[PDB]
Design a protein around this motif. Structure first.
Motif, mmCIF file in Angstrom:
data_model
loop_
_atom_site.group_PDB
_atom_site.id
_atom_site.type_symbol
_atom_site.label_atom_id
_atom_site.label_comp_id
_atom_site.label_asym_id
_atom_site.label_seq_id
_atom_site.Cartn_x
_atom_site.Cartn_y
_atom_site.Cartn_z
ATOM 1 N N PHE A 198 0.810 -1.233 0.000
ATOM 2 C CA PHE A 198 0.000 0.000 0.000
ATOM 3 C C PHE A 198 0.819 1.246 0.000
ATOM 4 O O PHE A 198 1.944 1.220 0.506
ATOM 5 N N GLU A 199 0.250 2.334 -0.533
ATOM 6 C CA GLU A 199 0.913 3.644 -0.484
ATOM 7 C C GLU A 199 0.754 4.302 0.860
ATOM 8 O O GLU A 199 1.634 5.035 1.281
ATOM 9 N N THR A 200 -0.394 4.080 1.511
ATOM 10 C CA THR A 200 -0.704 4.766 2.769
ATOM 11 C C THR A 200 -1.173 3.831 3.849
ATOM 12 O O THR A 200 -1.735 2.739 3.563
ATOM 13 N N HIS A 238 -5.011 3.184 3.625
ATOM 14 C CA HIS A 238 -5.340 2.150 2.652
ATOM 15 C C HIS A 238 -5.018 0.765 3.215
ATOM 16 O O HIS A 238 -5.796 -0.162 3.048
ATOM 17 N N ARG A 291 6.625 1.540 0.167
ATOM 18 C CA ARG A 291 5.328 0.913 0.258
ATOM 19 C C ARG A 291 5.183 0.227 1.611
ATOM 20 O O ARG A 291 6.145 -0.204 2.220
HETATM 21 CL CL LIG Z 1 -2.539 2.103 -1.628
#
Ligand SMILES: [Cl-]
Ligand SMILES: [Ca+2]
Ligand SMILES: [Ca+2]
Ligand SMILES: [Cl-]
Length: 285
Positions: free
Chosen positions: A152-154, A157, A193
């Motif tokens: 995931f980026e965040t 998320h 990530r």
């Molecule tokens: Cl993400």
């Protein structure tokens, strides 16, 4: 900031540097060894350990391929008997003869395996949502998620992805609880990530799919453990430990069973009822 622990290491026979968090405490009581689940690391105990520290010395090891422990060059060494050997090596290297064991899931299996070597070495123990009969529903799910490799980026998320698959396990949690959980099991990696904090090669089956239980009736291993002071925690909705198996465990003398309402596999041990249960167990040392 200041930490409640010190980072410590031990060496496996085959040359890996393996990692444990050590929390200082009462040298006149045995230490508390916290053994994580299959995909898990010392952070699963980050709050429990702070609640026990000082009153108890607390060791939170991470198996090869998890957390800050070295990854194996040979992924066929990612198997329960190897983790058991690595824990024997930790105990030998640290000079620990008697200890309290708190084991979640695979960690509970390892706790039974350690007890089997000499049950008198176990001052007391806690089995968190695992027993000598493992429900097939849960094993099917494990095979399905380990090493699947979502990233995931965040953090938000990531958290929402965890709720999507485990919201049945923890239906009453709020977003702060999901985020706290996410950070325990995932890490912001090199590539920027957020990913699960273990070697993806743990998913390689070699002789048997990941999570497979030893090919033995495990009641004898439970029973040897149950000769020592024992608490069994169970999630009310656990897909790994049935209510029936837990009541059979509890039928042994001295074994206390605590069921955590509205949660599944496994209690985080941050629930008030879990904390209080562990406190009662620790009094029996
Ligand atoms: Cl993400
Ligand atoms: Ca395997
Ligand atoms: Ca009391
Ligand atoms: Cl395994």
């Amino acid at each position: 900031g200041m930490a409640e622990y010190e980072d410590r290491y031990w060496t496996s026979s085959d040359g890996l540097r393996l990692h444990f968090r050590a929390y200082e405490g009462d040298i006149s009581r045995p230490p508390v060894l916290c053994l994580p689940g299959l995909t898990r690391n010392a952070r699963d105990f980050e709050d429990l350990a702070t609640r026990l520290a000082g009153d108890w010395r607390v060791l939170c090891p991470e198996m090869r391929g998890r957390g800050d422990s070295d990854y194996a060059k040979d992924p066929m060494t990612y198997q329960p008997m190897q983790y058991l050997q690595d824990l024997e090596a930790l105990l030998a290297q640290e000079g620990i003869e008697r200890f309290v064991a708190i084991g979640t899931s695979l960690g509970g299996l390892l706790t039974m395996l350690l007890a089997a070597a000499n049950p008198a070495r176990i001052a007391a123990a806690v089995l968190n949502d695992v027993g000598p009969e493992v429900s097939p529903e849960g094993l099917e799910r494990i095979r399905g998620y380990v090493g699947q490799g979502r990233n995931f980026e965040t953090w938000m998320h990531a958290a929402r992805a965890l709720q999507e698959s485990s919201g049945d396990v923890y239906p009453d949690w709020d977003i702060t609880q999901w985020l706290r959980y996410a950070k325990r099991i995932m890490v912001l990696g090199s590539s920027g990530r957020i990913a699960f904090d273990y070697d993806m090669k743990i998913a390689e089956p070699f002789e048997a799919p990941v999570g497979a239980t030893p090919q033995v009736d495990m009641w004898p291993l439970f029973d040897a453990l149950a000769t020592r002071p024992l608490l069994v925690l169970r999630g009310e909705t656990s897909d790994i430990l049935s209510a029936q198996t837990a009541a059979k465990m509890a039928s042994r003398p001295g074994v206390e069973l605590v069921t955590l309402p509205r949660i599944g596999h496994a209690p985080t041990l941050d629930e008030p009822e879990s904390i209080a249960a562990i406190g009662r167990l620790l009094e029996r040392v």
